[PDB]
Design an enzyme around this catalytic site. Structure first.
Site, PDB file in Angstrom:
ATOM      1  N   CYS A 106     -12.473  18.777  16.056  1.00  0.00           N
ATOM      2  CA  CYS A 106     -11.702  19.463  15.015  1.00  0.00           C
ATOM      3  C   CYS A 106     -12.594  20.181  14.000  1.00  0.00           C
ATOM      4  O   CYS A 106     -13.246  21.165  14.337  1.00  0.00           O
ATOM      5  CB  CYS A 106     -10.801  18.433  14.324  1.00  0.00           C
ATOM      6  SG  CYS A 106      -9.457  19.090  13.333  1.00  0.00           S
ATOM      7  N   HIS A 126     -11.528  23.246  15.760  1.00  0.00           N
ATOM      8  CA  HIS A 126     -10.119  23.531  15.590  1.00  0.00           C
ATOM      9  C   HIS A 126     -10.109  25.031  15.310  1.00  0.00           C
ATOM     10  O   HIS A 126     -11.039  25.554  14.694  1.00  0.00           O
ATOM     11  CB  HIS A 126      -9.546  22.779  14.392  1.00  0.00           C
ATOM     12  CG  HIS A 126      -8.069  22.950  14.239  1.00  0.00           C
ATOM     13  ND1 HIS A 126      -7.503  24.082  13.692  1.00  0.00           N
ATOM     14  CD2 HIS A 126      -7.040  22.169  14.641  1.00  0.00           C
ATOM     15  CE1 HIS A 126      -6.186  23.991  13.768  1.00  0.00           C
ATOM     16  NE2 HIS A 126      -5.880  22.841  14.340  1.00  0.00           N
TER      17      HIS A 126
END
Length: 189
Positions: A106, A126
């Site tokens: 992420c 992400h």
């Protein structure tokens, strides 16, 4: 043959799903996992307010190193705390120097940038963390759900957490173990 060991660094604001899924899955794989609190041994308030109690402080966990893999969960605020930590920089530098695996998911990979870790590697993050990660063009971006360039393993978000965790398991204990651990999870594929 001893069991592999994993260090998961947990900071305030960490994405709890990205923290728990890899810890759980790695333990299912027989990996000895240490959830280390960045700020200490006290409970950590994650991004969506789930409160997790670390196994030990990062300071103490460090003394029990080195680990076969150092895992950096995501969550914007969590990643920022990891990025500003001198202790984290030292741990990542050491892991990189000994040619040990580093896994981040992420927003977590942006901590690698902050600590100048693995420049030149192909990485993913992400989608919303791409610009931060690519500041300076020190890495080459990828849209693969899980990206692995040698000892730098990255992933994209909560929804890729299982894939990320299983990739770590395969890297440490092999394809067979990863497949054995995967079946009872009831993943779609």
């Amino acid at each position: 043959m001893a069991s592999k060991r994993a260090l998961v660094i947990l900071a305030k604001g960490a994405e709890e799903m990205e923290t728990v899924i890899p810890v759980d899955v790695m333990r299912r794989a027989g990996i000895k996992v240490t959830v280390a609190g960045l700020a200490g041994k006290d409970p950590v308030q994650c991004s969506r307010d789930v409160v997790i109690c670390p196994d030990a402080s990062l300071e103490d966990a460090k003394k029990e190193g080195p680990y076969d893999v150092v895992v950096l969960p995501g969550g914007n605020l969590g990643a920022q705390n990891l990025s500003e930590s001198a202790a984290v920089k030292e741990i990542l530098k050491e892991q990189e120097n000994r040619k040990g695996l580093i896994a981040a998911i992420c927003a977590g990979p942006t901590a690698l940038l902050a600590h100048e870790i693995g420049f030149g590697s192909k990485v993913t993050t992400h989608p919303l963390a791409k610009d931060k990660m690519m500041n300076g063009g020190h890495y080459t971006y990828s849209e693969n759900r899980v990206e692995k360039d040698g000892l730098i393993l990255t992933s994209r978000g909560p929804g890729t957490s299982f894939e990320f965790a299983l990739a770590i398991v395969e890297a440490l204990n092999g394809k067979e173990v990863a497949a054995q651990v995967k079946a009872p999870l009831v993943l779609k594929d």
